[PDB]
Write a protein that binds this ligand. Structure first.
Ligand SMILES: Cc1cc2nc3c(=O)[nH]c(=O)nc-3n(C[C@H](O)[C@H](O)[C@H](O)COP(=O)(O)O)c2cc1C
Ligand SMILES: Cc1cc2nc3c(=O)[nH]c(=O)nc-3n(C[C@H](O)[C@H](O)[C@H](O)COP(=O)(O)O)c2cc1C
Ligand SMILES: CCOC(=O)/C(=N\O)C(C)=O
Ligand SMILES: CCOC(=O)/C(=N\O)C(C)=O
Ligand SMILES: CCOC(=O)/C(=N\O)C(C)=O
Ligand SMILES: CCOC(=O)/C(=N\O)C(C)=O
Ligand SMILES: CCOC(=O)/C(=N\O)C(C)=O
Ligand SMILES: CCOC(=O)/C(=N\O)C(C)=O
Lengths: 362, 362
């Protein structure tokens, strides 16, 4: 089965094509991860996935989505990830991390605590920053402060320092969070970027923050470890053909700038959209980005059955299949997929203390 | 659903009727558990089971099954369990432990490393002890040393010391391992016990080691925490009616000795048997023990589907359903069962960072 073929990118070899995409846990305190994350990540890595990308980890305190978000804005924050890196590697998986800045969608409650912007009377909140002083709307009404040129320099340096820390902590795969309506995506989109300086207006200017951040990270991230990004390539806002064409052109520039793989997603920049949710619906879009930009890709949002994942690889729509929620339901989902796809010795997707007995359960 | 009704025994309340029975991991070193066990147990506890009984933990070095078995024969060994106890509790499950002595089945290889008695030239092996100098046979040919009265006194004290260490580590539930052909079971069975002293021959004599060990443990284990045992009530050796009658009588004497619940199993004392493996095959046997000995029971060996578990509880065959291998396959099996049985808010079997999203997946 294609899902269980290894994948090599730079010096990193994944044992199969199953990637666990970044999934915020909202369980950190002051950015510091803890026993929640340690067990959560170690268990999923033992489940068999070849790559585990750690959740959106803020490059700066105001770049957290919520008060429960992980951070990597100090060396002490980075050192807290070391046992997670070690547990993922000990399980035979590859440890990655998504480094992030939530932009105008920051200072929000946890999803099971309202999911909305923290009110001004709640001392847990903080001022948000963005390309322009314009709110997302809906449940995120807080108007962000428009970034200064010094803010732009500072946030870029925060991404550099976050990448340096991720490198030194032993991560073997990095993903820049340029998707999902957060800071990077909001620089690209004309919905959110009304700037009149070098960072807004034209395609070159809207791309500039993302390309400059990529280039700055490229200087500190090892050439032999995959340098990746997540990017929303369309919004389902009635502008899809033009937006996809521009996003694919930006992907070409990412490739020229040393990007090794693109996690293809939806922008989620504004709420006034009509996303056609369905099984594997991103398949054709990821395939178009992969083929037209000539870059390996992953995607998510409905590939979480063994046959859907296998079909996407066979059709050369994806290079890795990201499977998120199914791994929250079952940390050993990779083993479940190996069984369903008839992999020889499927139980040995898991470590010996499980595999021995489940082979004989069979 | 009966499977998701709470259960109270002494001062302990389990949130549902799903118990994870003891399952050796073979990953300890010199009896000390480590990060294998920490993640393994914490992840299963977060999966939703109401009770998690930690694997057979040796009361003495020679009572391990294998060089990978956990031990609790010193205070340092007990302290290693504290983070496991606390992680199970933090997940909302109840931490138990099975304390054990492998008897003539000790000094064996891990199951995926031959599963057989360690060879005499292998430096990892040790001298085994048993009621009588008689080998199990088959893949376990080593002849054990017949225990003296001094050995009997010492092993009993080892069980006492282990129970006191388990108490201080914070376990809320203890299970004495009198099953599966190990030391306790082998004192009961005429196949393995040929003694001519007070500990062999008659039913009273064969029961004596088990009753005296239970009574000695009772003096140090808190009256307000469940005191349980696992015991093989038949062998499938052509002597089932007589053996089950004797085993049920011993269960009555365990109850008179303060036992709160019996984990009903098969003896596995000798290899020359014909065990009729099948779904829920222990149901009728556990029901007979429960009704005739008037004692709460659990059992295992084929209850690991949601409907089989539910049916056994509704028929009053069991008070708790032990589900072992299904939790190695999926450490969130309790959530899978809640979904299959149509429990309201089934996703909230899991902690919020999973439950919130799986409710909406639905
Ligand atoms: C709990 C949760 C947290 C998420 N956090 C992140 C995140 O930190 N970064 C990110 O890029 N996507 C995040 N996402 C989106 C997922 O990576 C993924 O795209 C989504 O779950 C769809 O894939 P699936 O259908 O396999 O679940 C998150 C999704 C969930 C359910
Ligand atoms: C890996 C493994 C380890 C086990 N270790 C123990 C043990 O330490 N003590 C015990 O009493 N039973 C042990 N058993 C037997 C189980 O507790 C249980 O009775 C068996 O797995 C049957 O239940 P199931 O059909 O739900 O798996 C073990 C079983 C397995 C698969
Ligand atoms: C068998 C492979 O798994 C392991 O050894 C492990 N984590 O995966 C540890 C720390 O014991
Ligand atoms: C809905 C698009 O945004 C995401 O997927 C996300 N992070 O990227 C979270 C934490 O929800
Ligand atoms: C029929 C069950 O066989 C097993 O796997 C087992 N436990 O589950 C053993 C041998 O310990
Ligand atoms: C909200 C549930 O969180 C937990 O269960 C936990 N351990 O289990 C923590 C706080 O780390
Ligand atoms: C075959 C019966 O033995 C067991 O289940 C056991 N412990 O009790 C193991 C395999 O470790
Ligand atoms: C509640 C819907 O869950 C999702 O689709 C999701 N990821 O899978 C989000 C919003 O991040």
């Amino acid at each position: 089965s294609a899902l269980f073929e290894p994948y090599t990118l730079k010096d990193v070899t994944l044992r199969n094509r199953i990637a666990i995409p970044p999934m915020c846990q909202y369980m950190a305190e002051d950015g510091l991860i803890n026993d929640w994350h340690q067990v959560h990540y170690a268990s999923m890595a033992r489940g068999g996935a070849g790559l585990l990308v750690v959740e959106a980890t803020a490059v700066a305190p105001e770049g957290r989505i919520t008060p429960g978000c992980a951070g990597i804005w100090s060396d002490a924050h980075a050192q807290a990830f070391v046992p997670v890196v070690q547990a993922i590697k000990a399980a035979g998986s590859v440890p990655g991390i998504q480094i992030a800045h939530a932009g105008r969608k920051a200072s929000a409650n946890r999803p099971w605590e309202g999911d909305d912007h923290i009110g001004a009377d709640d001392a847990r909140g903080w001022e948000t920053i963005a390309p322009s002083a314009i709110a997302f709307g809906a449940h995120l009404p807080n108007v962000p402060r428009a970034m200064t040129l010094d803010d732009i320099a500072r946030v870029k340096q925060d991404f550099v320092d976050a990448a340096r820390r991720a490198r030194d902590a032993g991560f073997e795969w990095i993903e820049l969070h340029f998707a999902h309506g957060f800071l990077g995506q909001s620089f690209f989109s004309e919905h959110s970027n009304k700037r009149t300086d070098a960072y807004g207006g034209s395609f070159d200017n809207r791309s500039r923050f993302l390309l400059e951040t990529l280039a700055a990270v490229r200087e500190v991230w090892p050439e032999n470890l995959p340098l990746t990004a997540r990017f929303g390539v369309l919004e389902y806002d009635g502008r899809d053909e033009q937006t996809l064409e521009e996003s694919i052109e930006l992907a070409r520039r990412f490739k020229a700038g040393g990007l090794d793989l693109l996690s293809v997603s939806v922008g989620f920049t504004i709420p006034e959209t009509n996303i056609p949710w369905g099984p594997a619906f991103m398949g054709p879009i990821a395939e178009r980005v992969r083929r037209e930009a000539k870059l390996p890709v992953t995607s998510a949002w409905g590939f979480g059955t063994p046959q859907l994942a296998e079909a996407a690889l066979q059709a050369n729509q994806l290079d890795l299949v990201s499977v998120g929620r199914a791994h929250l339901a079952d940390p050993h989902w990779a083993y479940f997929a190996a069984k369903e796809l008839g992999v020889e010795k499927a139980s040995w997707t898991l470590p010996a203390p499980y595999a021995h007995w489940l082979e004989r359960y069979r």
